[PDB]
Amino acid sequence: NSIQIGGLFPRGADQEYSAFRVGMVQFSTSEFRLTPHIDNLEVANSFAVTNAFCSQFSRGVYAIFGFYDKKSVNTITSFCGTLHVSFITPSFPTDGTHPFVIQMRPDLKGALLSLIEYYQWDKFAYLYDSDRGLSTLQAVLDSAAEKKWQVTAINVGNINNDKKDETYRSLFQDLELKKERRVILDCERDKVNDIVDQVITIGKHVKGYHYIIANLGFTDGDLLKIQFGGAEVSGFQIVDYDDSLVSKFIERWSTLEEKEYPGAHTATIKYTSALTYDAVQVMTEAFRNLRKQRIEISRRGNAGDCLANPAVPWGQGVEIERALKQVQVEGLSGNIKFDQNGKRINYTINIMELKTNGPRKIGYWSEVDKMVLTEDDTSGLEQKTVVVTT
Amino acid sequence: NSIQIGGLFPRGADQEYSAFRVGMVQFSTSEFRLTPHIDNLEVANSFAVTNAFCSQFSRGVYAIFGFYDKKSVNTITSFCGTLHVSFITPSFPTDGTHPFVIQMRPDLKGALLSLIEYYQWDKFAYLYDSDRGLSTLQAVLDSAAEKKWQVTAINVGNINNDKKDET
Known about the structure:
The structure is cut from a larger assembly and holds two copies of chain A.
Chain A: E1 2-9, H1 14-26, E2 33-40, H2 46-59, E3 64-65, H3 73-83, E4 87-89, E5 101-103, H4 109-119, E6 125-128, H5 135-146, E7 152-155, H6 166-175, E8 182-186, H7 189-202, E9 210-213, E10 232-237, H8 244-253, H9 271-293, H10 316-324, E11 330-331, E12 334-335, E13 337-338, E14 344-345, E15 349-354, E16 359-365, E17 371-373
Parallel strand pairs in A: 1-2, 3-4, 4-5, 6-7, 6-8, 8-9, 9-10
Antiparallel strand pairs in A: 10-15, 11-12, 13-14, 15-16, 16-17
Helix pairs in contact in A: 1-9
């Protein structure tokens, strides 16, 4: 069964598209054929988003896969919710409960605030990139009212690439107006590494400082640059490489051709690429269940223009959303369960902390049992020579 | 000269449309005729925004007038900036410098922060609705880093109409 599906990959995200093709290798079947309509367009231009959206609406696809920007979170929720096409995304969680939104990145603030409750911080700086939204920024300020916090939030995303060198030296000096030692970063993996290299330039990676990286890719960043400086670096990892099911992927992942699968011939993988591979496992089990439902969803490809007034929905795509939210599969990100809105539940975030030996787990995050500390204890191998001032 | 123009008024904003018609009374002329294409649609649904937008693009209007939501600030800047149609809005200021955006509400943070500098406040609560954006919320936190402020910001826009009494 050839099933036309979406391919709205942002340009420059080909490692995700590489592991998407591994999902096309691993999870294709003769029971039904996945037919991607690959459109490598920029996710920022909502006009260009709308063009590849309505072309696949003119194609008559039964599901659409791709990322979404904050420039397109107002697009995809308004377009897929009206035309009743289920959309599968590995991007950031939405602000509101929108229908036809199946997300692969779970919530982070529950693991994030429990970590700050673990560290028991009261005054700490919080740099943030506005590009992934501001809901986590809204999340920390709601706890700042309750926990009497004195968090200093400063946006960093509007700083140009030419002068992200001198503004940052101005920035941490302004953090030394408060003499902060506790900075939780909220940036992209490149923008994380750029600012840490500026911390390297000024030397605030020394002992006395503490940093927390607020993403699921704590192992994705470069930890060797600041492993031996003195500051203690914490973070979250949803894709734990110690699993053999992950290790079976990695043993294939490094042996993948870089020229055929760009970004694949590596030792590790981004979590965004892993969730892209995890999403194909969900989509395969979906149409295996839609075959198990024996429900003919084969709407014709003549859905036509999305600018039909009124634009009629197609009711089989509503049932696709009903079965997608009932898909419960194990993947690289662990146990996957959904709500009635497409949000991931029963997931488990592994809190990883960089130590002298490397990144090491102190505990996993649970949705109902928030922080359960792992007693994997080598006692840090020492006592780190307690500083006695006089 | 009959000049086709836009009419994307949000529903329930008819006092604005009333004074729009007074502008049609006061500022119409025989030198050129304003031809409104009035589309009273909800500004939240960006799909419905796109329908009345491209219908006026199919109309061939020379300018488009109407409001924009924060659900459509990512729409109108992406659509009017690409199709190169000038857009006139009385809505809130944009976050970025976008072309073809003519705004009627000016900036507020320069008057706002100077007022707090007048009152010389250091710790003060700041309730905010997220529906007009968060740039002013970003504005006060940038001054909070400089002026050592202890501002408590709490969102209020997500509270339902049924229980906006006990919360």
